[PDB]
Nucleic acid binder design. Structure first.
Ligand SMILES: [Mg+2]
Ligand SMILES: [Mg+2]
Length: 757
DNA sequence: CGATCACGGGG
DNA sequence: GAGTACGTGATCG
């Protein structure tokens, strides 16, 4: 009867057991299923071949792996009936061990659905959807503070504070005496970590909210717990938090709970040049949050002075993490429900994967064999594919800019023109739609797999919107608002998904055709805007920016709002143009490279700011000054003078060496590097002096004056002697400051050579 | 040139 | 864990 919050599998006597984690009227419940079997499909040249194929074996865990059962099944592949063999295996881990040995067989045409994780395969095949119902979950935010010194190995310093927050308040656990009402003083780091364990086990939250807990709080807690020889039984089955390598980074799971890391969530939802907790909190709640930096924390801890400030910082970190979690969780819960996969997985995935997860479930429901993910070569061939058929933007600084969004136009185009990989250039097709300019043909004889699903999504959203108008219950209304927004997000991701290189249902011709049909409406919007005195400053497939040159801002807003209302009255069906926002000033460099400033003075950029540790402060500071001179002062001449002054100061050795430090992490043992960059050259010298260089250590260096590649001229920041060493002014000018500002100033007709005296 | 390698968030 | 993240820009070899 309960709400499914997660699913996984355990192995018992070498056999897999599925676990379904549920919340039923406030109670945690686990259901176990020992009956679900792993499988793959094999398309054979002939039915006689099954006798050779069913006899294929592999090895795993010292035992030989066999196909347990085979079953001839009738399915659909690319809108055509197909006969494949369902090959059953005992354990999920048998699938990577045997799949290549089945694929290699001369009688095997191809294999299918050989990389779907067991718990995700279970939820699809059994028709189970997470987050259904009105079941109320409990939340706890968790955060930590540590003792850090520049360039230390990860986990060297102790955890000095652990903070948590829920509706009962925000609290701090520390092992140094601080006299504040929300601070619990314990005897040691060990006792503080054990107190966190107790809080989590006693509060028993369904959701543990963190800010970058995947890649900091939890790996750090695990490192220090290992060090101190203590366990972290945070799982509802008493298991420890589990670190999963998700790409080049990490993801942490806590069994029986939802580890909700806000960092990947917020990074997708909103646009910010830097997603610090303080920048994120202000963007959403319109309130400032003070940042207490690592060096200030270390100084207060070691000296024992100003610890009240550090404890307040730790408390506020947990407090706002709780507040942000409550804000961002409902939408992730509805997306999980819509796509039919747990929030843990859905909150950490791109919209492209959300679409694919939705499609894999619908393919099962429709008996449609899923196409395979591409191999490296295909993935690479897809990235190099050229699309025919979005001009260069207007130069200079523009005032009073309206932003219009086109994204809600594309699902309707996909549906009306039956744009799908299964309908593309079909043989013996009776009726078809021809894409303008690109000429791709889409069969009209049957609804395509993707248009069919999109149509149902848009219909469901219209029902939800109608139920919302007719509802008196504000609780149902709030919930229905989240559900209709989840459909809008998923439906507006299909256009992009067609061109997503990793997509199973990738279709270059589909994406191209949606673009070509879409363009007819964009050209109509542009002509209608220009007939109304508007100048289009920037236009791409997602939207445009426009202004009425020299008009009053309120007149621009009114005319734009009146235009959107008008055009939508002209557009058929669910084709919708949206007024996104207004900006006091802005400039446009190229496709998805631009900067704006709103009426409250907040700078908004896309594809231009360089806030990262592997760029020197002098380059990042100059870039901020250039954007401020342009957007806040409306003065490109001031911006050019700033660059010219900084470059001359660098030439005359007038810039502090501290603004010239470059930081780069060591990501593997030093011997595993194939290319030795400056930070590796610096690292190798440190290791030679006896420094324990380890992956995760961040190397700070300065590029000195001299001959050859910068690798041979980089010096460790701790070894830099201003009275002896001379930094490379030409490197900091040509490779740091000038690349940071040259893109920006190209929009104003400046080349890299005009930004020096 | 192609290949290799780094960034983000968090102390 | 029957998945891996991404997109982009600098520097090395
Ligand atoms: Mg999981
Ligand atoms: Mg903190």
């Amino acid at each position: 009867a309960g709400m499914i919050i997660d699913a996984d599998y355990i192995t018992e006597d070498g056999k897999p057991i599925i676990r379904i984690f549920k919340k039923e009227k406030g109670e945690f419940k686990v259901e176990y299923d020992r009956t679900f079997r792993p499988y793959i499909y094999a398309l054979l040249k002939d039915d006689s071949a099954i006798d050779e194929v069913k006899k294929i074996t592999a090895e795993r865990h010292g035992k030989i792996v066999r196909i347990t059962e085979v079953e001839k099944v009738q399915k659909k592949f690319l809108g055509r009936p197909i006969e494949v063999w369902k090959l059953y295996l005992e354990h999920p881990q048998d699938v990577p061990a045997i799949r290549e040995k089945i694929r290699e067989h001369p009688a095997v045409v191809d294999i299918f659905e050989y990389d779907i994780p067991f718990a995700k395969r279970y939820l699809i095949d059994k028709g189970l959807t997470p987050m259904e119902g009105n079941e109320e979950l409990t939340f706890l935010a968790v955060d930590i503070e540590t003792l850090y010194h520049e360039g230390e190995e990860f986990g060297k310093g102790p955890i000095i504070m652990i903070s948590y927050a829920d509706e009962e308040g925000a609290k701090v656990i520390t092992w140094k005496s601080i006299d504040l009402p929300y601070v619990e003083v314990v005897s040691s780091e060990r006792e503080m970590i054990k107190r966190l364990v107790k809080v989590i086990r006693e509060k028993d939250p369904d959701v543990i909210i963190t800010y970058n807990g995947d890649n900091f709080a939890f790996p750090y807690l695990l490192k220090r717990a290992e060090k101190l020889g203590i366990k972290l039984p945070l799982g509802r089955d008493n298991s420890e938090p589990k670190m999963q390598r998700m790409g080049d980074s990490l993801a942490v799971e806590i069994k029986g709970r939802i580890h909700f890391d806000l960092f990947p969530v917020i990074r997708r939802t909103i646009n910010l040049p830097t997603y610090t907790l303080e920048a994120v909190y202000e963007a959403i709640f319109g309130k400032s949050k003070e940042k207490v930096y690592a060096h200030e924390i270390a100084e207060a801890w070691e000296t024992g002075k100003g610890l009240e400030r550090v404890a307040k910082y730790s408390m506020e970190d947990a407090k706002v993490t709780f507040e942000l979690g409550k804000e961002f969780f409902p939408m992730e819960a509805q997306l999980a429900r819509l796509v039919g996969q747990p929030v843990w997985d859905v909150s950490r995935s791109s919209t492209g994967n959300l679409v694919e997860w939705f499609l894999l479930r619908k393919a099962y429901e429709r008996n449609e064999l899923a196409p395979n993910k591409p191999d490296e070569r295909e993935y690479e061939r897809r990235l190099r594919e050229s699309y025919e058929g979005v001009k260069e933007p207007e130069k200079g600084l523009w005032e009073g800019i309206v932003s219009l969004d086109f994204r809600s136009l594309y699902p309707s185009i996909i549906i009306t023109h039956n744009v799908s990989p299964d309908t593309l250039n079909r043989e013996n097709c009776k009726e078809y739609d021809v894409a303008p300019q690109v000429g791709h043909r889409f069969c009209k004889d049957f609804p395509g797999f993707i248009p069919s699903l999109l149509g149902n999504l848009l219909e469901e959203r219209q029902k939800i919107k109608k139920r919302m108008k007719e509802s008196k219950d504000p609780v149902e209304k709030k919930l229905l608002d989240y559900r209709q927004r989840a459909i809008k997000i998923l439906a507006n991701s299909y256009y992009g998904y067609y061109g997503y290189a990793k997509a199973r249902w990738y279709c270059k011709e589909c994406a191209e055709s949606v673009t070509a049909w879409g363009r007819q409406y964009i050209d109509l919007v542009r002509r209608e805007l220009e007939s109304r005195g508007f100048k289009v400053l920037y236009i791409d497939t997602d939207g445009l920016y426009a202004t009425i040159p020299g008009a009053k801002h309120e007149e621009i807003k009114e005319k734009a709002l009146k235009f959107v209302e008008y055009i939508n009255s002209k557009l058929p069906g669910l084709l919708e143009l949206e007024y996104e926002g207004f900006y006091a000033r802005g400039f446009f460099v190229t496709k998805k490279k631009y900067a704006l400033i709103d009426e409250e003075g907040k700078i908004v950029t896309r594809g231009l700011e360089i806030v990262r540790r592997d760029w020197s402060e002098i380059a990042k500071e100059t870039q901020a000054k250039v954007l401020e001179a342009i957007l806040k002062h409306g003065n490109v001449d001031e911006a050019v003078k700033i660059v010219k002054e900084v470059t001359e100061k660098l030439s005359k050795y007038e810039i502090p060496p501290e603004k010239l430090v470059i930081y780069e992490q060591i990501t593997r043992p030093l011997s595993e590097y194939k290319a030795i960059g400056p930070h590796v050259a610096v690292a190798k010298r440190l290791a030679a002096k006896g420094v324990k260089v380890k992956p995760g250590m961040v190397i700070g260096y300065i590029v000195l004056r001299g001959d050859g590649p910068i690798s041979k001229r980089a010096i460790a920041i701790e070894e830099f002697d201003p009275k002896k060493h001379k930094y490379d002014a030409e490197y900091y000018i040509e490779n740091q400051v000038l690349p940071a500002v040259e893109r920006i100033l190209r929009a104003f007709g400046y080349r890299k050579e005009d930004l020096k005296y």
